[PDB]
Symmetry: C3
């Protein structure tokens, strides 16, 4: 009986309808995945922005603090001139040891974060 | 003649439906691994933001305390050097008298904002 | 009749060319999603590295400044001893207050970021 050609065509049609619904599920999930990835990108940018602003202000203040401390060291050595300066009065294996100024290096890091986030606006 | 022409084409259709089904299987597997991989990235963002903001909080608090003491020191040094025109006149420079910015509340504000962004990962 | 079976067979095959097309569209999209994800991972790593390099420097210099400020307090207390020390001459509820040293605590947070990022090289 050609009733076979009816039924096997039916199963094929049935199976196509399953395939299309599974493609439907996949498609909607891809739209969901793309959305979440953009939301994640957005959070990375916003977070990097806040963090680098915090870094900027810590760094500006650190350097101003350092200037004043180095000035204070000069003036305290002056007042301790006859005692051999702080180097002799307060004496430590790292007493005279100079104070690093990493403000430009930290600035350079801030610039590198800013440069990375510029790249989001193309990716 | 025709009985086999129906058959072979029905076989070609069926077998192509098996290719599609397996192709779908592999797509589903990649989709699952993608969602997992996104999940782990989100996780690392939160943990790294958490660690970084903790460091910022501590640098900030200490920087403020240090500032407080440098302020006292300048005062004491201005007092001690008073009969020489204060600190200002003795250890000169175009920026000797310069006030020291206090950015502690502005940094704290930046910490707040990161914490707020991370809160939002718990809603998606 | 023949024309019916054949005409439906055509409709099947037409759906198949439509399915295979949508699938290839999906596959191309999955590959643009994978590339996007890896670019994002790399931005996270670079960004974290620059930020922690900035934290490391700020921390190092903050710790040096602190050692110097502490010395200076001893020096100013020695100088103003014939007048009650710093606790009397500027007199505040946080004048003699000990300055916290969080350099190990900050180094710990830097370690923790480096460990989180080392993990990207496994996924």
């Amino acid at each position: 009986e050609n009733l076979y050609f009816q039924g096997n065509m039916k199963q094929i049609e049935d199976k196509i309808e399953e395939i299309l619904s599974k493609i439907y599920h996949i498609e909607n999930e891809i739209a969901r995945i793309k959305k979440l990835i953009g939301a994640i990108a957005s959070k990375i940018i916003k977070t990097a922005n806040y963090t680098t602003n915090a870094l900027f202000l810590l760094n500006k203040e650190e350097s101003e603090i350092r200037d004043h401390v180095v000035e204070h060291e000069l003036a305290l050595n002056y007042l301790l001139a006859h005692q051999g300066g702080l180097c002799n009065v307060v004496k430590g294996p790292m007493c005279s040891s100079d104070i690093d100024d990493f403000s430009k290096n930290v600035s350079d890091m801030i610039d590198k974060v800013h440069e990375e986030m510029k790249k989001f606006y193309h990716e």
